[PDB]
From a paper:
Semaphorins transduce signal through the plexin receptors, which are single-pass transmembrane proteins localized on the cell surface. Ectromelia virus secrets a protein named A39R that is a Sema7A mimic. The class C plexin PlexinC1 is unique in that it only has two PSI and four IPT domains in the extracellular region, rather than three and six, respectively, in classes A, B, and D plexins. Structural analyses have shown that a dimeric semaphorin binds two plexin molecules through interactions mediated by their respective Sema domains, supporting the ligand-induced dimerization model for plexin activation.
To address these questions, we purified full-length human PlexinC1 and reconstituted the 2:2 dimeric active complex with its high affinity ligand A39R from ectromelia virus. We determined the structure of the complex to 2.9 Å resolution by using cryo-electron microscopy (Cryo-EM). We then reconstituted the complex into peptidisc, a recently developed short peptide that can stabilize the transmembrane region of membrane proteins in the absence of detergent. The cryo-EM structure of full-length PlexinC1/A39R complex shows that the pair of the Sema domain in the A39R dimer bind two protomers of PlexinC1 at two opposite sides, as seen in all the crystal structures of plexin/semaphorin complexes reported previously. The overall architecture of PlexinC1 extracellular region appears quite different from the ring-shape of class A plexins. The Sema and IPT2 domains in PlexinC1 make an extensive inter-domain interface. In particular, Cys412 in blade-6 of the Sema domain and Cys703 in the C–C′ loop of IPT2 form a disulfide bond to covalently link the two domains. The cryo-EM structure of the full-length PlexinC1/A39R shows similar convergence of the two membrane-proximal IPT4 domains from the two PlexinC1 protomers. However, due to the different architecture of its extracellular region as compared with class A plexins, the two copies of the IPT4 domain are arranged in an antiparallel fashion (See details below). Our structure shows that while the β-sandwiches of the two IPT4 protomers in the dimeric complex face to each other closely, they do not make any direct contact.
Author numbering:
A (entry chain D): 37 to 511, 520 to 537, 544 to 549, 556 to 558, 573 to 586, 659 to 789, 793 to 807
B (entry chain C): 12 to 391
Write the structure that this text describes.
Amino acid sequence: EPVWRSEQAIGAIAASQEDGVFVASGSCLDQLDYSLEHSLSRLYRDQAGNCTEPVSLAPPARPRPGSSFSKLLLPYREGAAGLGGLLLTGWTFDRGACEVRPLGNLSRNSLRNGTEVVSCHPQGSTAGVVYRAGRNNRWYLAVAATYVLPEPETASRCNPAASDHDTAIALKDTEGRSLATQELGRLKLCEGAGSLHFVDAFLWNGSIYFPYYPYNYTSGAATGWPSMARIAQSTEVLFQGQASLDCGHGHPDGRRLLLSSSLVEALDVWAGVFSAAAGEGQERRSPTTTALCLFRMSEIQARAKRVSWDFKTAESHCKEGDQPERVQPIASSTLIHSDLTSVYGTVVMNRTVLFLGTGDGQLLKVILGENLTSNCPEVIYEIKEETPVFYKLVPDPVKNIYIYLTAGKEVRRIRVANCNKHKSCSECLTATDPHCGWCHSLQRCTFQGDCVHSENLENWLDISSGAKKCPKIQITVTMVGSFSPRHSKCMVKELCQNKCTCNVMFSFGSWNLSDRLQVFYIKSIEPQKVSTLGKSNVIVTGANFTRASNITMILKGTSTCDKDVIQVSHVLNDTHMKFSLPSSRKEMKDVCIQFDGGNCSSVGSLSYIALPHCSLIFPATTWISGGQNITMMGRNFDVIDNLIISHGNINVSEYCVATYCG
Amino acid sequence: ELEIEWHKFETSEEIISTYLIDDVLYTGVNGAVYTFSNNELNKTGLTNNNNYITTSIKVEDTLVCGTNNGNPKCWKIDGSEDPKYRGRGYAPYQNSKVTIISHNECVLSDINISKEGIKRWRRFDGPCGYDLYTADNVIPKDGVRGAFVDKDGTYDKVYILFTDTIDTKRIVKIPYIAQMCLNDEGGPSSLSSHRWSTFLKVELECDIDGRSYRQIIHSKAIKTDNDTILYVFFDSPYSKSALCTYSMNAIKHSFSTSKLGGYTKQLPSPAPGICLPAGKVVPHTTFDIIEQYNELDDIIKPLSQPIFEGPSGVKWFDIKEKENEHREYRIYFIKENTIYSFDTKSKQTRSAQVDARLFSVMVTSKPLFIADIGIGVGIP
Ligand SMILES: *[C@@H]1O[C@H](CO)[C@@H](O)[C@H](O)[C@H]1NC(C)=O
Ligand SMILES: *[C@@H]1O[C@H](CO)[C@@H](O)[C@H](O)[C@H]1NC(C)=O
Ligand SMILES: *[C@@H]1O[C@H](CO)[C@@H](O)[C@H](O)[C@H]1NC(C)=O
Ligand SMILES: *[C@@H]1O[C@H](CO)[C@@H](O)[C@H](O)[C@H]1NC(C)=O
Ligand SMILES: *[C@@H]1O[C@H](CO)[C@@H](O)[C@H](O)[C@H]1NC(C)=O
Ligand SMILES: *[C@@H]1O[C@H](CO)[C@@H](O)[C@H](O)[C@H]1NC(C)=O
Ligand SMILES: *[C@@H]1O[C@H](CO)[C@@H](O)[C@H](O)[C@H]1NC(C)=O
Ligand SMILES: *[C@@H]1O[C@H](CO)[C@@H](O)[C@H](O)[C@H]1NC(C)=O
Ligand SMILES: *[C@@H]1O[C@H](CO)[C@@H](O)[C@H](O)[C@H]1NC(C)=O
């Protein structure tokens, strides 16, 4: 579990093919070894040595877009014949400057500089992608950014000249001097929808896609549909279309923010994390605000019509024509969730794996089924501090069993599969985790690379074989499944045979096996913050709570995981009843209550909560007489049942709220 | 008085452009291109779908570009295909009036580059550098009316005359001349990297009796000993037109010394309009200023003479210095049907009727008049 802690919150991160992991934290950009141990090199962009943020950036509401100083950071040309890879880094400083540089020792000279490449507004969006274009296949860089923000102070003037005022997408050239944009190599803007916030940029099928959404940086609320702008992969902007993405299913007003994106490459499926406006941090945080939606790139590629809705076209006026078609996600896969923050999709052994990062420091992965149906996500790793996961996950390029989880100001390298809990075959093969397979020589559920040391490949049994294909005893007794060796010895109790041989035992050269209608009113429900371990006693207040035999409570947290259905513990006064909730995963579950028969009565949200970890004890020492209100600061204290003072135990009161208590 | 002999085409072919390339007349018409030299009218067909030939510039060979049916495309002189496949900013998407000049090998033009048609003034790729374009709304939708290249002592500069249409409380037309550095490198930034960084402009002024003329028709800069003299022809919505003359030396001095209109502070060290040594790039402060306030707080007043007023609706005008005297010209300006000559010395205007739909007057050694009938050549 190797961690690399920066000093200022991470602004960007990329992972080169063979030159380490670049992390742009504050004013400085570091490069590290893939083990995240030693900063091999470091660049200072603002001032030498001192790489504190020149100004202060407010980390806003988790749905609201963040802010940083390192807009662009992407490596390219790597893995070339002899040419060392390049790294293109663009910062807010110097009017949104961008320098090409050699991918490697950071303290080498920037090859080509360039100004006004990326948005020079710390909270402005920017997303870039390089590609091959031109008659000689130069390396171009398509950058979509929020260049003009209506927050210019007379001190410094970021916003570019009045000609480039409404510029959204520009096709820079990485060879020309200062990364020159052609005249036609830029995509204009319609000035009505407020600003646009671009989330991503990726290539697919000879085109560049920019997932964005309209946005009011002053207000903080989306002002339209999350959309995707599709551009021809050429040297001059050829606007090929724009399509809105309709992932507001399961929520009243819809989900109109796009929090993160990822293109599942070998599957031709885009995967986006949408969210609705969650008030101020967490006030309208519902059990269904965020949703992972999967779209077929073919449908977006086909449904995107060149309409002048957000971008100026040469054939219409702003919003004086058609409205962009709304593309519907792959319905069998959408995963609703109270707090989702980032997504990263990949394909391993012909199975889609979508890692997701939640707004409470969880990295949990889902494995899509046969018709891209989502399974209930397994929680891989949990951040002890519940910091919201940074919206980009990067897979380790040199060891495909790792992924670089970024959170706040800390990066770490975590494996993509927690397969040490599986102890048998079935546990290792019914879970259908593509990364994990059973290993006979070790007799353990492990990755492939960790057990293909014996050259007979069938030693490491994977899922494509099927869960039934592990060795078992068959009755005239024999071994079934896929064993590693063809020579074994059977012994029953008490006939023995040898080899493919014939209490029961089959021993091999490296392992072994052995086996011998009235109204119903709900005032409220308390508490509303149950710890993860469940709560034995949840009091529902209301009326007429005795005019019913079979009263049930149904909690639903994740649109893929099943529902918690429970019966009332002991029906108290016709105004009060009591339930007992079991253990679960950190979540914010919706609670309906359905009486003897009828529709669910949605009493309200109810959030499981991480266990209370104890940060600090304010006085930390008091007189043996005591009586001083020791204050304890921590996280998730509101769910505390009570306290113990062990030395003999002493019961003592508590006066607490969420974060601290005395 | 004027006797013109007529080398006419086989049919009345709608004229679309006329150019002088090394004393050879290149008349771009619909379909073919005509080539006049030594009283020889060699017609060369290229295509005939729409193909309004409009450009006949000279870079290395005198390539000729037209608009084949909403697709602009060039050719070598004799119908051959262009090796470099030029043709985007070289011919308009539809029949229009263009302004395209060619210095040594460096084509500058206002021709529309795309279908929609935002008007800009561009230098295309070649020995000067990569393409360049003026910021938007700088060039009026009417286009650039005249363009010519002149030394600034050491650096070539490009001058263009247009007529802006300002509209604040009432619509006022304003004639402008604008200077740019032929070898400009573009602005400093990445967005403003293909934009002219040395573009400046002043108002001209052609007032005679309190009647100020403001609509440029056509310009021509004659090169003389001490300097070059710029002849502009203004039209008016009233019933008059006026030829004025300006001293390019006065204009250059005004560009170098005058102050930017609306900008009150101190101009930076590489003064805005000033050309820079090869490879140098305008700083960012100079460029921000030169893009915000690109007009000098000045107005070029014409020379003393020849200012004169002729009819309204003149279409072309070309100069021919008299062989006997010197600095005394005959200005042949042409209307839709009627030729007019004007002698700068005698200040008398002669006229003459011609039954044709005239298009232009060119002057190589004898005024040849390009009308839809064909070409004519004049002797008085
Ligand atoms: C680093 O630079 C920032 C610039 O805003 C300044 O506020 C800070 O005090 C500097 N810190 C050091 C240690 O120089
Ligand atoms: C990077 O280059 C500098 C320049 O001399 C050198 O001092 C440093 O050791 C180099 N570091 C690496 C990791 O190459
Ligand atoms: C910016 O560009 C100039 C021009 O070459 C160069 O001198 C300077 O080093 C560049 N700045 C950076 C930080 O690379
Ligand atoms: C929304 O955006 C518009 C245009 O950017 C701005 O004028 C308005 O103030 C914004 N909303 C609020 C509540 O300020
Ligand atoms: C790739 O683009 C072409 C261009 O029209 C399109 O016909 C084709 O369907 C696209 N590929 C897929 C898989 O949709
Ligand atoms: C019912 O009993 C519970 C305790 O079992 C008590 O808290 C509640 O106030 C009582 N309500 C009524 C209406 O008697
Ligand atoms: C010292 O006393 C202060 C008084 O509030 C307290 O905040 C702090 O936690 C104590 N311990 C220290 C400073 O180590
Ligand atoms: C101790 O402090 C907490 C808050 O700091 C307060 O709520 C509590 O009542 C205090 N206890 C005493 C005995 O003052
Ligand atoms: C005109 O065409 C004739 C026909 O061959 C040719 O001999 C003559 O040289 C041409 N003249 C010019 C100026 O093209």
